[PDB]
Amino acid sequence: NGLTGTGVLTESNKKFLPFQQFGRDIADTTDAVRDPQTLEILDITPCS
Amino acid sequence: AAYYVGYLQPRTFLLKYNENGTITDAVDCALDPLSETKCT
Ligand SMILES: *[C@@H]1O[C@H](CO)[C@@H](O)[C@H](O)[C@H]1NC(C)=O
C-alpha cells in the first residue's frame, strides 16, 4: 500500500492496535507491518 | 454527576513504552528543574 522495501519477511508476536499499521525503530526503518488483506503482523529484516 | 475541565498548551513530553506496546510513563519538560534534568 505504498510502503516499498526489500528483505526477509516473517511473522511476529507483536499485536498492533486496530489503528496501528506500521512499526518504526530508532533508525526510522519499517520494522513490522500489518497486512491489509489478512490483518496479521509481519517482521521485516534486511539481508546484506 | 460532576465534570472536570482542563486546558492544553504547547509542551514537549517524554514518553516510555511497555514491553508490549502501551504507554506506561510520561515526563513533562516544564514541570520543575529536575524534569529538565531528566529530559536533557
Ligand atoms: C504483555 O502482554 C501480556 C498479556 O498479553 C500482559 O500480561 C503483560 O502485562 C504485557 N507485558 C508487560 C511488561 O506488562
Side-chain angles (χ1 to χ4, degrees):
Chain A
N1 320 129
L3 194 65
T4 300
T6 290
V8 172
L9 309 180
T10 63
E11 61 268 15
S12 193
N13 308 83
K14 307 159 192 169
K15 48 181 69 65
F16 279 12
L17 283 168
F19 62 95
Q20 282 178 331
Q21 187 55 39
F22 322 101
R24 294 205 168 288
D25 292 313
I26 301 154
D28 295 20
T29 184
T30 306
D31 177 33
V33 70
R34 175 196 288 276
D35 175 83
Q37 314 163 8
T38 77
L39 63 88
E40 76 199 86
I41 303 309
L42 311 175
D43 280 333
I44 308 190
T45 47
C47 65
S48 300
Chain B
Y3 66 91
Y4 311 132
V5 55
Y7 288 110
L8 320 179
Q9 288 195 280
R11 296 278 183 77
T12 306
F13 268 70
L14 190 77
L15 296 174
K16 176 189 177 292
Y17 287 73
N18 194 238
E19 189 272 334
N20 41 62
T22 180
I23 285 178
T24 54
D25 216 352
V27 169
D28 193 353
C29 292
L31 168 65
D32 62 358
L34 181 61
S35 313
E36 304 156 40
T37 295
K38 272 183 178 179
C39 298
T40 300

